[PDB]
């Protein structure tokens, strides 16, 4: 029975019931979308970085020819630094999130995202896509740092729990039983070398013996010495390494130590069996990274054939899922539903689209930036509008040769109701070379201002487009209204026309206290007939009868002012003020010219003039009934004016 | 968020966002349209105004774009579309801010639908009634909302709608003017795509096949991601059918067809970014569908509510 309506909004959909007594409406969101300031600020950090990345990080071939050695360095460098920077903006988002409540669940979903990034990092943005065994320093340190943040196993909590177990074998301490060496060997396998040295120290291992007779120390010293030395460069590097890593156990097994039959037996056996046989390394791997590192570093033991070996190791016994490509997918599926759906089908596997993507490439992140951003625009989150155009301008997307018809559709569809929204529309119109849509925008804006009760913003809006016909129609609207009073209607109009382009008048413009535009606005050209009406009013107040009459006639004669504003200007202004006029002397020329205009333009009927006549009467009647009542009476006052010039 | 009562005393026939989606209007058998403006603060729809916009049951209401100002067309069983413009400086909470632009007595049967044309195709509105006459109205000017001429009529249904042929009947347009002007119209089992010729008389340009049951909703997707079209139909047999119509006159192809509601899909409604279809159907659950990179729509999420 339920019906659902999906608007443009992306966070505020509506479900409803078509049934009586079911008049309750339930707001429905789309999960995994946030309109938060934390989210747009995250996006803002990613946007600068994403743009600057160029065509790099999509795996291009690094040329080292004459075209162009320098490109190789540029490509490897940019992508690597961009990774570091992406992780820090990512920390900042995540940090905000695990400090708020009900985002206890979200906090956990973001620790997983870090894990996939850590595995990716270790291989290509640490090593630099070089050799497997390039950097050692940066590999260990980054991994350890990450496991600390991506995963929650404190060097403290983890190893307390492990030391608290020591019972159930012997009553003797943790280091005299299996519990400690199982961990110690694990820490070494996960490349958590720093923690591992510390674990020996904490356990109280060092007082407990103080004897030994180990020979393997001296050996390893002198070997590495001669080794690293090179008496002229010796091939003995790999050969010696291989021998050393293996031979350790057997020497320990003979060396005298005064310790119990627990400790000794365990350590000997353990150490041997583990780092001796391919299977036993994997047997004690409780994670993919342990197995993955373990073979390269600790088995046969420098970068040679460690390839084939690691492959085979894995292929034989499967190891625990971590967070890799397919691994969180395999984790997730058994789990809750909402995940598993969008999760699957995003790996380049049994598809043609992602095959097509990397073959041409050798910009998914860019697409995501241009995808998410647009989705938010269609909700009204103005913050991502700068982001959108910005990625387009540099590290451009779209073609200005066929995606012009699609992009065109987006400009009007998206809710524009700030400034940033408005600036984005114009910005895109210049860039793709379609000025005509920007002119349509300005028309569309005037049409909003007309029904929102802004008879100022509307005029300005239309003015921008430069079409004389529309500006004139609003001036006339307004010119007509201000004819029922002997001043210009309200005061900001008034002010602005009379202050001219000089600082004249102290009268502040608009409801603002600003003097700023009281030194600008000289109503001229299009606004010139409108300007002259307001000025005719100033002239009565500054007691001119002569120049006053003159301005009023000038407008009456103008053939581009309406004809229906005849009976209106003369009825309100010329008809009462009959005396003042009568005093003055009028010649044959002025009389005859005024007369032609009355003969042609005066109306005894018509739309505008019938309506305007009804209101004149209501204000203060000049004529009782009939417009051209006036003509007869007027001519009398006119005979007198004519007679008085002539005597 | 949270449950809210609209305050309509009869049942809600429609929920329609603005084009900018800043308003929701609901219409009911209680003779009112209630228009709510979105308070983001509570993420609830707070009552702006309520007025009787006809002297009968209001069953189709639709917003026009706030690009010419806010216009309301509303369809009633009293035979008239009544056109209304929102004034902010007119009173709210009284029904004094909707001034009647017109009454169109150009509808000879009782209306069941009136639906606006998208911004991009011009300001036009289509009608359908219970005399089975598709009405094409063109405003004479986009700034004169007080007259609309009947420019075309096409006799859709073979038998007119009567007290048992009564079903949801829907009018949807083509958001692209970079595609020839059209409007898809679903009436019973047939969905017939009408197109404006160069003669100013509408012709049948295409028929949508593969409608095994009644179409309870038809919704034309804005062409975004691509410049081709997609039309989704919700049908009574739990089928979401998304057919793709390519422009080369029109070619018909299927994109995908899948059925998952399994009772009847009552509504299909596309987002305005034309990439997420949400459909609801019998069983009370709303399925939210997003395209894969195998280029087909799949159910990413299931929301269950009340019946």
From Swiss-Prot, chain A:
Its main location: nucleus. Keywords: Membrane, mRNA transport, Nuclear pore complex, Nucleus, Protein transport, Translocation, Transport. GO terms for biological process: mRNA export from nucleus; nuclear pore localization; nucleocytoplasmic transport; positive regulation of DNA-templated transcription; protein import into nucleus; ribosomal large subunit export from nucleus. The keyword GTP-binding does not apply. GO terms for molecular function: structural constituent of nuclear pore. Belongs to the nucleoporin Nup85 family. Present with 7920 molecules/cell in log phase SD medium. PANTHER family: FROUNT PROTEIN-RELATED, NUCLEAR PORE COMPLEX PROTEIN NUP85. Functions as a component of the nuclear pore complex (NPC). NPC components, collectively referred to as nucleoporins (NUPs), can play the role of both NPC structural components and of docking or interaction partners for transiently associated nuclear transport factors. NUP85 is involved in nuclear poly(A)+ RNA and pre-ribosome export, in GSP1 nuclear import, in NPC assembly and distribution, as well as in nuclear envelope organization. This is Nucleoporin NUP85. The gene is NUP85.
């Amino acid at each position: 029975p339920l019906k659902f309506k999906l608007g443009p909004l992306s966070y505020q959909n509506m479900a409803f019931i078509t049934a009586k007594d079911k008049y309750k409406l339930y707001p429905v969101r789309i999960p995994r979308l946030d309109t938060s300031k934390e989210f747009s600020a995250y996006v803002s950090g990613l946007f600068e970085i994403y743009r600057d990345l160029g065509d790099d990080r999509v795996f291009n071939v690094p040329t080292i020819g004459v075209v162009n050695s320098n490109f190789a360095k540029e490509h490897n460098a940019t992508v690597n630094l961009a990774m570091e920077a992406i992780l820090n903006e990512l920390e900042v988002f995540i940090g905000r999130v695990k400090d708020q409540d009900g985002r206890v669940n979200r906090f956990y979903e973001l620790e997983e995202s870090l894990t996939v990034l850590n595995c990716l990092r270790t291989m290509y943005f640490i090593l630099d896509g070089q050799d497997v065994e390039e950097n050692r320093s940066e590999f260990i340190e980054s991994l350890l740092n990450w496991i600390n943040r991506s995963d929650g196993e404190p060097d403290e909590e983890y190893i307390e729990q492990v030391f608290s177990v020591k019972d159930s074998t012997a009553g003797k301490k943790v280091f005299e039983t299996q519990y400690f060496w199982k961990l110690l060997n694990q820490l070494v396998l996960r490349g958590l070398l720093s923690q591992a040295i510390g674990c020996i120290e904490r356990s109280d291992l060092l007082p407990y013996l103080s004897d030994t007779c180990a020979v393997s120390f001296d050996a390893v010293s002198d070997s590495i010495e001669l080794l690293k030395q090179y008496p002229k460069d010796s091939s003995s590097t790999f050969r010696e390494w291989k021998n050393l890593v293996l031979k350790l156990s057997q020497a320990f097994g003979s060396s005298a130590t005064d310790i119990s039959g627990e400790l000794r037996d365990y350590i000997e056996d353990f150490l041997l069996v583990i780092g001796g046989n391919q299977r036993k390394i994997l047997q004690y791997s409780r994670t993919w990274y342990e197995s993955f590192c373990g073979f390269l570093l600790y088995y046969i033991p420098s970068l040679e054939l460690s390839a084939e070996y690691l492959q085979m190791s894995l292929e034989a016994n499967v190891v625990d899922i971590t967070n890799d490509w397919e691994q969180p997918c395999v984790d997730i599926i058994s789990g809750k539903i909402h995940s598993i759906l969008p999760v699957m089908e995003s790996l380049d596997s049994c598809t043609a689209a992602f095959t097509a993507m990397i073959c041409e490439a050798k910009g998914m992140a860019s697409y995501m930036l241009n995808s998410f951003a647009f989705e938010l625009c269609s909700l009204g989150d103005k913050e991502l509008w700068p982001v959108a155009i910005g990625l387009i301008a540099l590290s451009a997307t779209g073609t200005r040769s066929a995606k012009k018809m699609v992009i065109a559709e987006l400009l009007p569809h998206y809710p524009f109701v700030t400034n940033d929204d408005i600036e984005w529309m114009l910005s895109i119109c210049v860039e793709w070379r379609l000025p005509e849509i920007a002119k349509e925008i300005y028309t569309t804006l005037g049409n909003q201002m007309l029904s929102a009760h802004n008879i100022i913003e509307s005029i300005a809006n239309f003015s921008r487009a430069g079409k004389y016909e529309l500006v004139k129609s609003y001036s006339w609207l307004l010119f007509e209204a201000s004819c029922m009073e002997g001043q210009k209607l309200d005061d900001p109009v008034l002010n602005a026309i009379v202050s001219k382009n000089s600082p004249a008048e102290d009268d502040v413009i608009i409801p603002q206290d600003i003097l700023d535009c009281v030194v600008t606005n000289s109503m001229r050209q299009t606004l010139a007939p409108y300007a002259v009406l307001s000025q005719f009013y100033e002239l009565r107040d500054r007691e001119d009868w002569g120049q006053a009459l003159r301005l009023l006639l000038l407008l009456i004669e103008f053939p581009y002012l309406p004809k229906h504003y005849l009976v209106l200007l003369v009825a309100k202004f010329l008809y009462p003020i009959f005396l003042l006029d009568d005093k003055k002397l009028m010649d044959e020329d002025s009389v005859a010219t005024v007369i032609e205009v009355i003969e042609t333009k005066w109306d005894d009927a018509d739309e505008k003039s019938s309506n305007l006549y009804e209101t004149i009467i209501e204000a203060d009647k000049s004529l009782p009934s009939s417009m051209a009542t006036l003509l007869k009476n007027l001519r009398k006052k006119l005979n007198f004016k004519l007679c008085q010039a002539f005597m | 968020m949270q449950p809210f009562d609209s305050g309509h005393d009869d049942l809600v026939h429609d929920v329609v966002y603005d084009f900018y989606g800043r308003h929701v209007a609901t219409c009911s058998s209680d003779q009112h349209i209630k228009v709510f403006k979105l308070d983001k603060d509570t993420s609830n729809w707070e009552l702006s105004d309520s007025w009787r916009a006809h002297d009968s049951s209001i069953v189709a209401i639709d917003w026009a774009s706030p690009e010419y100002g806010r216009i309301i067309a509303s369809a009633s069983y009293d035979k008239t579309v009544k056109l209304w413009e929102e004034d902010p400086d007119q009173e709210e909470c009284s029904g004094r801010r909707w001034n009647k632009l017109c009454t169109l007595n150009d509808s000879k049967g009782s209306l069941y639908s009136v639906k606006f044309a998208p911004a991009h195709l011009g300001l036009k509105l289509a009608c359908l009634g219970n005399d089975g006459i598709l009405r094409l109205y063109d405003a004479l000017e986009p700034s004169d909302l007080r007259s609309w001429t009947l420019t075309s009529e096409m006799k859709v249904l073979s038998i007119p709608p009567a007290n048992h042929l009564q079903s949801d009947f829907c009018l949807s347009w083509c958001p692209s003017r970079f595609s020839p002007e059209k409007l898809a119209v679903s009436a019973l089992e047939q969905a017939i795509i009408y197109q404006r010729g160069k003669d100013g008389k509408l012709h049948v340009a295409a028929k949508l096949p593969g409608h095994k049951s009644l179409i309870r909703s038809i919704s034309w997707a804005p062409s975004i991601g691509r410049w081709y079209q997609l039309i989704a139909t919700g049908c009574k047999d739990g089928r979401i059918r998304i057919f793709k119509i390519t422009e080369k006159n029109l070619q018909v192809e299927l994109l995908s067809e899948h059925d998952d509601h399994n009772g009847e899909v009552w509504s299909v409604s596309w987002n305005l970014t034309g990439t997420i279809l949400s459909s609801a159907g019998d069983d009370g659950k709303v399925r939210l569908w997003k395209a894969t990179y195998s280029n087909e729509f799949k159910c990413m999420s299931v929301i269950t509510a009340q019946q």
